[PDB]
Symmetry: D2
Subunit: 238 residues, 4 copies
Amino acid sequence: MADTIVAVELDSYPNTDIGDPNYPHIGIDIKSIRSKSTARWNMQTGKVGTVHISYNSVAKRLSAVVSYSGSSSTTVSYDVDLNNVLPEWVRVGLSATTGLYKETNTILSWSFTSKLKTNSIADANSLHFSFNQFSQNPKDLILQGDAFTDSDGNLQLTKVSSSGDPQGNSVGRALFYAPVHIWEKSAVVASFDATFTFLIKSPDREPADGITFFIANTDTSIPSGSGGRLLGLFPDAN
Amino acid sequence: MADTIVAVELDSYPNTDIGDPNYPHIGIDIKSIRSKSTARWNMQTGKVGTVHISYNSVAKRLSAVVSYSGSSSTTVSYDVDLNNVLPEWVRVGLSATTGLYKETNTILSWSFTSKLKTNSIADANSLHFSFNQFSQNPKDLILQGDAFTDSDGNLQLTKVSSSGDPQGNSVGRALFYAPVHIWEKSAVVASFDATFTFLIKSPDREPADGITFFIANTDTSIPSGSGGRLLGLFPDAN
Amino acid sequence: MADTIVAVELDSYPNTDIGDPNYPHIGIDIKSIRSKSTARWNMQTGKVGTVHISYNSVAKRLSAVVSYSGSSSTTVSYDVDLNNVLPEWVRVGLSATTGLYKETNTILSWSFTSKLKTNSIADANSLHFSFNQFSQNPKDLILQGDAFTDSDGNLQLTKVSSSGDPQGNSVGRALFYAPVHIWEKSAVVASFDATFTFLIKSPDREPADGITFFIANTDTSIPSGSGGRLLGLFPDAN
Amino acid sequence: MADTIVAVELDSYPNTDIGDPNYPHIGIDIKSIRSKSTARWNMQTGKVGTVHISYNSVAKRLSAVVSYSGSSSTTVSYDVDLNNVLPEWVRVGLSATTGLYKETNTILSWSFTSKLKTNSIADANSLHFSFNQFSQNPKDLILQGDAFTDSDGNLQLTKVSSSGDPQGNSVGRALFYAPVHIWEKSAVVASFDATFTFLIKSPDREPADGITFFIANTDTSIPSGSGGRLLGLFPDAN
Ligand SMILES: OC[C@H]1O[C@H](Oc2c[nH]c3ccc(Br)c(Cl)c23)[C@@H](O)[C@@H](O)[C@@H]1O
Ligand SMILES: OC[C@H]1O[C@H](Oc2c[nH]c3ccc(Br)c(Cl)c23)[C@@H](O)[C@@H](O)[C@@H]1O
Ligand SMILES: OC[C@H]1O[C@H](Oc2c[nH]c3ccc(Br)c(Cl)c23)[C@@H](O)[C@@H](O)[C@@H]1O
Ligand SMILES: OC[C@H]1O[C@H](Oc2c[nH]c3ccc(Br)c(Cl)c23)[C@@H](O)[C@@H](O)[C@@H]1O
Ligand SMILES: [Ca+2]
Ligand SMILES: [Ca+2]
Ligand SMILES: [Ca+2]
Ligand SMILES: [Ca+2]
Ligand SMILES: [Mn+2]
Ligand SMILES: [Mn+2]
Ligand SMILES: [Mn+2]
Ligand SMILES: [Mn+2]
Ligand SMILES: [Mn+2]
Ligand SMILES: [Mn+2]
Ligand SMILES: [Mn+2]
Ligand SMILES: [Mn+2]
């Protein structure tokens, strides 16, 4: 049985044969690579970008924003009730790919908070983590595929040479080690927010393929055939 | 020279003559007592209730949920860009009233978090406070009208007798002492979250008038003529 | 090789044989059951207690306080550099035992925060979790020995019958699932704090054996021979 | 009539005639400019520094660490019960002065957390603010003397010219707007943590005079005659 995925994609490469708009874009992916909602993303290759993501079960609106120093931001939102989509326990992560074309998929920092409140006025259960650099052997991350942490304390989701040159046909992901509780039968409100900073560099005219923040079943793994345009998340483009 | 008001009301008394639905309701108030959105509130007089309020500038949805132990919740939301409504600096507060009819408007706890993030590398600016108990002399609150802290460590927004019985024609508010920064020219995303627990008791078969969490110009004060149905927030019913 | 243990013990049963003082006590344990520091704990069996523990690497003072509603608190401290003791990556946990004599070792809530500041700017890393009730399937806990979560949402560290009657000769522990990063080469300051609430009930005249909060090597497991007076932490009394 | 002051000073200029050690030093000040504890400061004029300060009422140890890019660290600690020094309600702030000699007293960020926990089931009361830039009109700061926010979003505690050259005989302070509750009779534990980053530059061979983080009576003001060596904090050198 396939994983169940919700993701925010920073999609650098337009794959118009599988429903991408014809420009780099941000998107909200609900169980499919074909985003439920997109916005045109004005990439700044070579510059550090920031992504902020948030949701809560009352508003039922998942939103993301991407910005760079000085520049205008790109936003995207989608109305969705995540408890109709995801299981009650999840893992959260980051993924990235390259394909025929390539780019660095470098993460410089990543934080995440979730809260789960029940009517029983026990206060909310909560989880927060923050990484402002990464350990070169990160015991609180599950690294999958080609993901690794370099000597600069950067998380490299996809392969780069010793010179820092990105490689094609690469896929990797990093999940936080602890499962996250995002609903239960008695729950009143669940919320989460996530931030990460990133550095996509590329020598290619058309960099590819992009980076995501994603939420999945706890035992999620890189699907077979999920390289390139599928962002290490899906086994097909349905 | 009137205040600028955004509020979530727990309106226990139907004033159908000024547009209330004909039942106790939770509502979102944008510069008018006449709610832009309401939902039926199934009151549990004598039982401790919990309200959670959330907003962010990307999703632009103001949401609130009210619940009691072992009971279903009631939610209300309204799509609104708060930057088009409120000033950049605000104060946040709780208000309550009684009129001809009455209830205790007792607050057992109140917390609030705000974050403001700009395009810069700088992490979000933030404020958080949490009161799970109120001090006899709460120097971090601006107490307005009949509002006072009692011997049990509770905030009473409106008058109660020496034996704990509510009095009619009362108005009271409590503002957090520090102004909150909610937008800036340079801003990328702003968000706030708030929670309070409340205890409404009444000897009246129909209690009145309600409690709000509100946001306003920093110099906000109880308007003249704001008693009873106007919840201590508005000078008229327009 | 043997685990590395730093613990705060709530030691309900005096084993004067192995150096316990002749009264219930709160103790700080560094690599030995024989506490580096103790203070008398005036137990209130059948009443909900609270423990707060804190440390930072500049002050180098590990402190704990135990209290009950309307009671005098008891404090214990020890001056130690915890990096002389602990590995850079640890798991944090709660343990309990019963032996010949018994008690319930019930956990009603548990929170923990750690922060590590280096050379990057704001926290190289932070981790916080808060459990105000425990799920029936707590996927973010590693439960060892007899530890289980019950129908009331409490964490029971040691065995209880269907009636809630504690059992003798029981051992149980619960670890937070994710490893915690408490030091690295570039580190300037590291800190943590933890809080738990507990309900110890017993039909025995002298309840036994107690509860700890502990920090260990990530791969920590209940040592052979760690029953009773050794609190599920140590293979012997050295 | 005189303020009540607790401070951590970064004293760039040795005033031996008022009991400074004869080198730049960090110190802990309890109701006097004459530090109760000092450490030689591994000082790096022209480089951005970071300060971390912490205290809790159980350990009763006020500790500070100053470092630069995670290196050149200086630490100072002092054993003191702040309950016996400070009032229950305070304001927290930053101060800085120049005198005959001069330096920029630039603050690039400032954060603060306080927690106060009593016997009750009630969880901690708390306050947190984080400023990673300073806005043009900081309505949540009480700016005293020469302190202002500049075009870069930095807080300048003392006078700098239009070109960025520091001026002599300056004094400035910034207080967080909300009073902070650091103790109550029913308290079990109270704690606070403060961080700030700073940038001290000087065309002088000897910069002066220094920067402090301080905790005072809520109504604290710059004492008359508190320039230069007295750091904007004390009326005299007693
Ligand atoms: O990295 C960009 C893309 O490269 C590959 O698709 C192609 C894009 N342009 C091409 C041109 C020729 C050939 Br053959 C291929 Cl496979 C492609 C595939 O790996 C895609 O999944 C990926 O999105
Ligand atoms: O507390 C409930 C209500 O009591 C008063 O309104 C009346 C309720 N019943 C009435 C009957 C007659 C007249 Br006149 C009035 Cl104003 C009222 C007014 O104080 C209202 O503002 C308030 O909402
Ligand atoms: O639970 C209380 C204690 O019970 C046992 O030790 C004894 C305490 N009193 C005794 C009396 C007789 C014998 Br045999 C034993 Cl083992 C004990 C052992 O299980 C101890 O580890 C434990 O601390
Ligand atoms: O900025 C450094 C110092 O400059 C002044 O003190 C003097 C330093 N050298 C002097 C020489 C003569 C005289 Br009079 C004075 Cl006050 C001083 C005073 O402003 C001091 O408070 C300050 O610490
Ligand atoms: Ca694509
Ligand atoms: Ca009404
Ligand atoms: Ca013992
Ligand atoms: Ca000096
Ligand atoms: Mn796409
Ligand atoms: Mn947000
Ligand atoms: Mn209404
Ligand atoms: Mn919330
Ligand atoms: Mn012991
Ligand atoms: Mn603490
Ligand atoms: Mn000095
Ligand atoms: Mn700290």
